[PDB]
Amino acid sequence: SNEVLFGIASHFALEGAVTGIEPYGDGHINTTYLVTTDGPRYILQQMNTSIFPDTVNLMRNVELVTSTLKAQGKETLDIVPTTSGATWAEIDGGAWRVYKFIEHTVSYNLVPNPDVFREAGSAFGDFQNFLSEFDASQLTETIAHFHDTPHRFEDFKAALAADKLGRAAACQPEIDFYLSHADQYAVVMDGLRDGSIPLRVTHNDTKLNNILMDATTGKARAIIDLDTIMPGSMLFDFGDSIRFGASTALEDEKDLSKVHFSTELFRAYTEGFVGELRGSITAREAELLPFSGNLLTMECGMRFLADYLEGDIYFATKYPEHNLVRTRTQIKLVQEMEQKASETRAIVADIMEAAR
Numbered sequence: 001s002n003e004v005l006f007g008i009a010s011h012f013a014l015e016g017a018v019t020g021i022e023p024y025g026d027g028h029i030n031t032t033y034l035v036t037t038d039g040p041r042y043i044l045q046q047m048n049t050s051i052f053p054d055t056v057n058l059m060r061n062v063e064l065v066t067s068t069l070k071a072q073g074k075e076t077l078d079i080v081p082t083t084s085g086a087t088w089a090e091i092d093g094g095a096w097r098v099y100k101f102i103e104h105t106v107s108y109n110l111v112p113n114p115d116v117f118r119e120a121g122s123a124f125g126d127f128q129n130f131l132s133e134f135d136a137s138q139l140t141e142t143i144a145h146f147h148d149t150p151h152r153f154e155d156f157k158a159a160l161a162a163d164k165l166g167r168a169a170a171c172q173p174e175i176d177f178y179l180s181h182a183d184q185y186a187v188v189m190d191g192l193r194d195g196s197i198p199l200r201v202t203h204n205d206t207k208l209n210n211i212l213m214d215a216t217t218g219k220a221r222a223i224i225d226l227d228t229i230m231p232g233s234m235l236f237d238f239g240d241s242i243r244f245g246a247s248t249a250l251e252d253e254k255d256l257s258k259v260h261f262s263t264e265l266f267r268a269y270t271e272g273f274v275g276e277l278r279g280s281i282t283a284r285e286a287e288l289l290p291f292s293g294n295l296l297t298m299e300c301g302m303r304f305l306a307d308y309l310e311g312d313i314y315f316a317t318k319y320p321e322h323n324l325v326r327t328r329t330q331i332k333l334v335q336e337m338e339q340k341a342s343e344t345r346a347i348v349a350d351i352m353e354a355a356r
């Protein structure tokens, strides 16, 4: 309520007298408010400390990345300090932060067309490019092992072994798909480990609703939602974007005849992404762009299936078989990626040469 909210806002060095504070946006993790003043506007968020208990480390990650982008004249989340100079405030139990409102933007939920998907690729390619000289090792793992696929596979096997709901009996083909792909899961972790794949900043929630684009030009403006900034390989981010974004269907589509991996959307994202990162991407990274799609789609699928086997404790579900329906789309997508490897390899090689 306003009196509590107005009081909360008083903790921050706003550059305008507060005039209103109301719920804003469609975020589901933090609690987001729009602060209107006699002047500029702000985003005020109560941070979800159940999901992110370590506020100091999370905000440290956000400060490091945003400071680097700001230092280079790049638009990003701009933290407004507390009146005491901190990046966030402890208030009667809660953890609160303020960002300058990024004005004159729009954003998308579902991918509307290849052109917008290309611009999403451009947004994250630009993000990667301007962080190419940032020492990613300074960042902490806010969610440990987040895209450590071998670790996720161990978790999957534990859920399978426990079979607490006796659900394994009903999904043998899905289980065997993940078991049979076992020797593929370590490709990127091994690469990061031996230095053949660069350690880079990773965003880890590359969904389009985190890419603000200009309200008039439609061009990428800024990457937001920096809660999950961590070290990793950019292949984790690229692969996941391909996972959700190059599908012709929703993640929980029941009719598998409608679920396809679209090479047109793959080409669109890759054009935008590589177009901005051509001077930094390594040969090994380029080599793995198509496979990163397989990897992150398999990782996501195995997590859905593990959750199904464990009684749906991690992902929200709407009906008993929701996670099983989800895992099946991810399986369909990977098999198509496997079968179109010739095409995607050729697509990447062509885009690499064109970007020059």
Ligand SMILES: Nc1ncnc2c1ncn2[C@@H]1O[C@H](COP(=O)(O)OP(=O)(O)OP(=O)(O)O)[C@@H](O)[C@H]1O
Binding pocket: 024, 025, 026, 027, 028, 029, 030, 031, 032, 043, 077, 078, 099, 100, 101, 102, 103, 107, 209, 210, 224, 225, 226, 227
């Ligand atoms: N600096 C900003 N300027 C303008 N709009 C913003 C800013 N930060 C967030 N938003 C908007 O606020 C809402 C919440 O965004 P954010 O991605 O930070 O939410 P979240 O709490 O991480 O939840 P989720 O992970 O579900 O998105 C979105 O509608 C987003 O468009």
Ligand SMILES: [Mg+2]
Binding pocket: 027, 209, 210, 224, 225
């Ligand atoms: Mg978001």
Ligand SMILES: [Mg+2]
Binding pocket: 029, 205, 225, 227
């Ligand atoms: Mg978020």
